[PDB]
Amino acid sequence: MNIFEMLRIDEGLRLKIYKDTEGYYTIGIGHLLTKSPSLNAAKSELDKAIGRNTNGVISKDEAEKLFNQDVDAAVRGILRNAKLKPVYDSLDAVRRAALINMVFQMGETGVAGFTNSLRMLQQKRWDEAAVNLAKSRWYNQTPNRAKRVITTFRTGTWDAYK
Ligand SMILES: [Cl-]
Ligand SMILES: [Cl-]
């Protein structure tokens, strides 16, 4: 298992614009297009992202190319972030994938705000960190995906995904 297969289980793949769990226009593998209510503002972003006139539909390959950019950006954002970097550096390979996942989903700003949990991870207090992470809108809103990520943090194995 690796970050790509993990995120592909959590986000799915859709080749036509769809609305995410929060109601926003997305396409491919969890690629957020816009938070604007307009489907047109969504198709415009999409065409800008792909470099062609897509009419709201893209190929598997285009979907995978967006995914490659997004995971790459997620990693680079963590490494540029003063709050996140020290956390990531301290973690093993499995847990690192868990933090990338949260970033991909909620952005660097959002994750960076989980101050207390971050401190617990850095300290390797797994059980306490898992308990704290669960007290969040995140866990309340997408409980099944949150449990998987949380279990990856507590355990350090990919069990939740197998
Ligand atoms: Cl883009
Ligand atoms: Cl969920």
UniProtKB/Swiss-Prot annotation:
GO terms for biological process: cell wall macromolecule catabolic process; defense response to bacterium; peptidoglycan catabolic process; viral release from host cell by cytolysis. Its EC number is 3.2.1.17. InterPro entries: Endolysin_T4_type, Glyco_hydro_24, Lysozyme-like_dom_sf, Lysozyme_dom_sf, Phage_lysozyme-like, T4-type_lysozyme. Gene3D superfamilies: 1.10.530.40. GO terms for molecular function: lysozyme activity. Changing residue 132 to M/F: 2-fold decrease in enzymatic activity. It is found in: Host cytoplasm. Transmembrane segments: none annotated. Optimum pH is 7.3. Changing residue 20 to A/N/S/T: Complete loss of enzymatic activity. It comes from the Viruses. Endolysin with lysozyme activity that degrades host peptidoglycans and participates with the holin and spanin proteins in the sequential events which lead to the programmed host cell lysis releasing the mature viral particles. Once the holin has permeabilized the host cell membrane, the endolysin can reach the periplasm and break down the peptidoglycan layer. Induction: Expressed late in the viral replication. This is Endolysin.
